[PDB]
Structures are given as C-alpha cells and as structure tokens.
Symmetry: C4
Subunit: 93 residues, 4 copies
C-alpha cells in the first residue's frame, strides 16, 4: 500500500516531467510526449518518435538513467504486491 502508493506518485511525476519537456523542446503534442516518455522509460523504444535536437538527446540520456530505476521499481511492486496476490485469490475455488 504505502510503498506502492509512493512508487505510483513518483512514476506519475516522472511521466509528467517528460510530457512537459518533449512538448516544449521537441514540439510534440502532449499525448505524443507522454507516449514517448513511457516508450522510453520502459525501454521499449519503437522509434516512431525520437528527439531531433541536441538538447532533446542530452536530456533523454539523463532522463533514461534516472527514470528506468523507479519505473521498473513500480512495475515490480505492481506485479509482486498487487497482481500476484490477486491471481492467487482467483485460484481458490
């Protein structure tokens, strides 16, 4: 609970920061900026969008090193503290 909540808030703030940056510096729509932020921090990287400016590339490097840690943390706790118990509870007939 309290741990998953913190991680949830930290993830939300991280994605908000990305959305604001890419819509500003790279000129993306806010929706596309959020899309790029997620596709980046989860390391999926389709490359349908990518930073065209040097500022954009430099920020993204730092965004990645800082962002991956907490994003996968959230993903991990979400799966281990939320999804796991639920699946088990559904396996009791």
């Amino acid at each position: 609970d309290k741990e998953f909540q913190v991680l949830f808030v930290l993830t939300i703030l991280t994605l908000i920061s990305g959305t604001i940056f890419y819509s500003t510096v790279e000129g993306l729509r806010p929706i596309d900026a959020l899309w790029f932020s997620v596709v980046t921090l989860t390391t999926v990287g389709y490359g349908d969008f990518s930073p065209q400016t040097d500022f954009g590339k430099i920020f993204t490097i730092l965004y990645i090193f800082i962002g991956i840690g907490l994003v996968f943390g959230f993903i991990h706790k979400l799966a281990v503290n939320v999804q796991l118990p639920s699946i088990l509870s559904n396996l009791v007939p």
Copy 2:
C-alpha cells in the same frame, strides 16, 4: 508445474487480449496484432508496427505497465524451472 501452468495461461490470455485490440482499433491482421503484442511486452520494440491512433497509444501505455510483469515472470520461470533442469540433465554423461 502448477506455477508454470498458471503463468502460461496468464500469458496466453494477455496475448489474446492484445491480438483482439490491435486488429480492432489499429486494423492490423490478427497475426500482426499478436506480433506487435509480443514485441511490445518483451520490450523488444522493432517499430515495424506502432499504434497510429490516440486510443491505440493510450491502451498500449496501460498494456505495457500491466503486461511486462507477468510476461517476464513467465520467461523467468520458464528458464529457471524448465530450461535449467533440462540443461543440467543433459550434462550428465
């Protein structure tokens, strides 16, 4: 066994859900929809396909956060509870 079976079923259902969504909203062939779902949840992300609609992008964001946890879980148990023993058994002359 019982753990790997559950994870196997959960993975199958997850991929089925993706196949139905992308063939519907993004208009992909069912085979290409399954292909995108896998390439997404394993975080490979070639970008040969990517969602063009806003609905598609929003769903994929949620699909990723929810899907990665179980997909890598399956991958992990598959390697640790199935592949590992087999390799060891083949190393006894």
Copy 3:
C-alpha cells in the same frame, strides 16, 4: 568456469540457430542474420531489420521467449563471475 562455459556454449548455439534461420527464411546475409539474432535476444530491437514473412514472425516470437532466458543468464554470469572480480583486482594498488 564450468557454469560460464556451459552458458557460453548455449549462447553460441542459440545465435548459430538464429543465423541459419534468418539467412534462409528471410534471405538475409549471414552477418545480418547474426546481427538480428543478437539485437533481438538482448531486447535492443533497432528495427533496421525485421521479419517480413509470417513464418519469420512466428519463429521470432518463439525464439524470443526461449532465447531471452539464456542470453541474459550468460550476460549475468559474465558480469558477476568474470567482470566483477577483474574490476576488484584492478582496484588493489
């Protein structure tokens, strides 16, 4: 040693299998086939190459689920049993 050797051989065989498949079914040069196999199993996925046939896509799905487990295993042991000690040994003045 014996563990890292096994993992090394298993990785080599896996990459050889990929090289043969993609040069055959997708018609890539052997070098490009090996390149795609690695870029796939390490989950990097540039998408400079991607399978164009349905056979190619179906095989790759299976290749991914089976291959990621051992490839990251090798990567892990390589870093924990080989790179780690070496760095420490270089930190003794």
Copy 4:
C-alpha cells in the same frame, strides 16, 4: 559511495569508448555517437541511428554483451543506494 563511484567511472569510460568508435567507424557526430551508445547499452534501441558497416555491427554485438552488465549495474546501485534513501528522507515530515 566507493561502489557507486567505481560504477560511475566504469560507465563513463564505457560511453567514452563508444563515442570514439561510432564517430570514427560510422562517421557520426560525437554527440550522436554518445547518443547511440547510451540508447544501445540501456537496450532502448530507437533505431534512429544504427550501424551501416559490418565492422560497426560486429563491434556493437560485442559492445552489447560487455556493456549491458555494468550499465544496468550502475543504474541499479544508483536507484538502490542513492535514489531510494533520498525518497525515504523526503517522506519524513
């Protein structure tokens, strides 16, 4: 501290080595060479850049197997020994 410092230096050197290689063999700007090195070793892989020469592809294969181990190590310690405590310290009213 001493552990995070070492990992920090090892990461810096790894990225420097990549920058020099890609600007030399693939003819990228130094900034784009660093960009590719990071996007590669964190496994994001946008594919906005990718090696066009066989030398480039062969080196990158080796760069990946060697580089991922330490890069994610740094990312891990950064998140567990630096980001984690800080967030907790900010949660004390």
